[PDB]
Design a protein around this nucleic acid. Sequence first.
RNA 1: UACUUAAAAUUUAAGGAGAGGGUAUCAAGCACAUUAAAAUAGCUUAAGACACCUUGCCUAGCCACACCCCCACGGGACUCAGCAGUG
Lengths: 50, 294, 113, 216, 126, 170
Amino acid sequence: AEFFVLTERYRQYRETVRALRLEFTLEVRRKLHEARAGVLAERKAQQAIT
Amino acid sequence: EVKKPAFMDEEVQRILTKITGLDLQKTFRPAIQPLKPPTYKLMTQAQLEEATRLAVEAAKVRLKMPPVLEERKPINDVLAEDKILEGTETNKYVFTDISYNIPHRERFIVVREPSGTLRKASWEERDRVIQIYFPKEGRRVLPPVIFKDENLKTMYSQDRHADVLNLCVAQFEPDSAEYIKVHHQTYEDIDRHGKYELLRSTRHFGGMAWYFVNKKKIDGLLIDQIQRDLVDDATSLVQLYHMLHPDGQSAQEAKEQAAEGVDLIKVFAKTEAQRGAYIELALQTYQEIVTSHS
Amino acid sequence: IVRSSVHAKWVVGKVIGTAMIKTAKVRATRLVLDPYLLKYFNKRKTYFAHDALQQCSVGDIVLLRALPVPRSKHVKHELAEIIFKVGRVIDPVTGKPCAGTAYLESPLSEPRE
Amino acid sequence: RKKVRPRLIAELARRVRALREQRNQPRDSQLYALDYETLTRPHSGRRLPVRAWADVRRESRLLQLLARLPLFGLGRLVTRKSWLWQHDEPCYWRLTRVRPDYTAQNLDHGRAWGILTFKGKSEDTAREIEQVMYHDWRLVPKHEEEAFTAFTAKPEDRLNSVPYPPLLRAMILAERQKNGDTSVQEPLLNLERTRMRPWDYPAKQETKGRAKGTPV
Amino acid sequence: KAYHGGHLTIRLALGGCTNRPFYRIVAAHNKCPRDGRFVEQLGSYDPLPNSHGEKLVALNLDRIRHWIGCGAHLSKPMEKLLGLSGFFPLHPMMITNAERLRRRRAREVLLASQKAESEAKETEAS
Amino acid sequence: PMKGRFPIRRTLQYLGRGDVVFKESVKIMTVNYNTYGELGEGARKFVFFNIPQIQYKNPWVQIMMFKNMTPSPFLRFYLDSGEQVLVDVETKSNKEIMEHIKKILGKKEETLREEELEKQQRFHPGNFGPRKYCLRECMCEVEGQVPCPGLVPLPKEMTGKYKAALKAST
RNA sequence: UACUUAAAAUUUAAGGAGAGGGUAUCAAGCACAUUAAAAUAGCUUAAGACACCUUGCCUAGCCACACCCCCACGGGACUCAGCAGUG
Ligand code: FES
Ligand SMILES: [K+]
Ligand SMILES: [Mg+2]
Ligand SMILES: [Mg+2]
Ligand SMILES: [Mg+2]
Ligand SMILES: [Mg+2]
Ligand SMILES: [Mg+2]
Ligand SMILES: [Mg+2]
């Protein structure tokens, strides 16, 4: 009775934690792209040349 | 509705800055701190006047008044109630988000209680833990013992009110109950003993006069300003009292008679002064001295 | 068209030798702070540069460009420009030939020769 | 520097050692031989776990079944006793290629390839089969294939979205109010993109390690 | 040391003195020593109740999310801390252990009641 | 007595007074000046007083100086793109020369402040560790927390020595 | 750890702005260069080459070593420089 209940708890827990790791993985890449090629990034580059 | 004046309103700060005053000798009184050998510069009268101007600019930034705020409201929010964890822990956990670039009033500080309730940290818990991880020079993690009524009375006997307030600003938040309690206790002791001069040319004078105006007890400050020949300041105080209490009998009387200058103070005595008889006596004596001598 | 790894992408120096074929030995100098004295002195380095046309002479100031791939063990730069030719300097400010602190051709004149 | 001298012996040893390994590679008949009296592998003297003892004596290996079939049972279906006990839905491999170990005197060790159908869902490509040396395989009879492989999928009932953790939900709603987005929508996690396979799902045999050829 | 293989992990590094434990939450390559080379410090854990009776956990939730987004594993004690905070769901064994404790205290209460009933029989005997 | 003329030039405070921090494009600054003359006095003072300050703030820029090669003094900057910025400093004070080069090829105050803040991003006051990197080594230092057993002995019931005795006693 | 294509941690290889122990009674090293018809005769060095001697350093830690023969196919005098312990 306890083995089965625990086995399902691990499956549902690990699914919830995998969804959160993916959401965190996307925030890292969004922030990186904004810094590399965001609006502010491009304007400053041309402003320096001008 | 006509907006109630605020502490930071450009008009109120003008009146409060004026009545506070400036004195480069009091504002820049020597600090009892580790010393270094003084430096010396040869300056003309033009250069010396420029340096005095810069000193007055710095004295303005030094006299910037600390905020006057309303008492914060207790934080009582329950994020979750996980009763499965009831009885599995003996002590509360306090979790603090210590990401550097968050304003301290926007940080999440939660408490997991032994019952299992996940709740937001109270104001006392928020200030204590932020001192532990973002320590501020001057502040202590636990409330100091100088703020006890017996210890505060000791500081008042020594005429150290500006320090009691300088300590209350380093330790407590402006909207905390402890902050308001200590400030309102210092202002009240100054009133009873007429020690208004202690906080002149200091950043604490505005809050003291603000407190008296809101509490309708400016009588003592007017009698004291008049006796020191600061009657332009006294008039500005009666203007601030006629600004924060527009519907008061005194404010309506000054409109009827279009009173200005010394007239405003006489109107206050007859209409709303708690001790009007004395305000006129001091005001009358001042006029006699000014007229008799000059 | 990736650039070289070497830190010295652009180096100025004096051609101290030219006895190798199509290569000029160049002495560059940089200022290094003495930590005890807090004074700057000259630290000099030797750079082999590819002189394709053998147009370099000992004593002339030159500009070297870092090669994308090192040509050999020591040849990792090429001759970008000859800033000053030895004895044949041309004033940058006015554009007239000079021989020391003097004008071989007056700047007032316009020979156009 | 320039005093870091060359190490010829070290380079010679590395190459020589690598060459011997290729020449004297062991075979499946040797690495996976077993002593059934002690349930210990002679090659390494590794004793099998206790939970595997019953099946090692009671079940067959894959190529023991396939060596008795024409063309080594290409096209036949093979299932595992562990799957039969754990999963009600059909689980089997459809054999496509089979490389027996000719060295074995009974052709009872080797490698196999096939198409996986796990819990009623079939993969689209054939890949190498793992755990071929396990005593867990059961050949499906030809006359029983139709009844065995019959499966009707049930509508999926595992939740597709779940709430956010209590603190992480409050941080999301707080950000909404700060940015001016006014809404009472409940933040929801999407679990469809990140759904986990069963723990006993067949793994990739191609990327799995093989034991070394030094006897213990 | 020059490690070959391994992954980044978020774990508790033990500090303090004897009978006075204190933990630093850190992100570190898994093969490094427990208190040795790390990549970033992500908080601290004080497991001893303070004057107010509070065990104090500090979490840099902005940097923690960054390293979980880059593949950082989590130790089981750290997964328990994130579950108690509310940042992660409660760990399966946190729930199971709480259930085991409930079943074990129910037995103790029942045994005490049976002993009291046995004591009541002694009272009846007088 | 510190040796040399104007020994103040050999103090860290003087070297740090330089205000010309070149942009990343600047790679080389050749200085052509004359040791004798009247129109090159500011250039000579620039080499004497300013070249040390410029090098201190721009350690990776090659400053190479040539003497008495041309009739007039000038400054030529070599950029990474391959552009060459020639400056003519004749009849110009050393202070004027510094201001000119600051404007054309000097980083702005805003840019320099941003770089300073980015450098310190990974220092956190809450972080515990050695004094070189952190304010506090241990949580025992914090007020209200349990003090270090070395400074203040722990209660007997909080000690493993005592707990072990009870477990044996049980 | 993600995608059918990208964020990290951790390494390896080729390098070089600058810095980096002692002895100059170690003053020359002796192929240590370039070109790319295969010729030219060069390269390093008193701004310290080369030779020898001594030393762990860069300290949230790093580097080297793992019975010996720098290595470890091989050979040999054949293993605690893991914990405790012994001569
Ligand atoms: S140094 Fe903190 S407990 Fe001893
Ligand atoms: K060795
Ligand atoms: Mg397995
Ligand atoms: Mg001798
Ligand atoms: Mg060895
Ligand atoms: Mg030994
Ligand atoms: Mg050993
Ligand atoms: Mg030992």
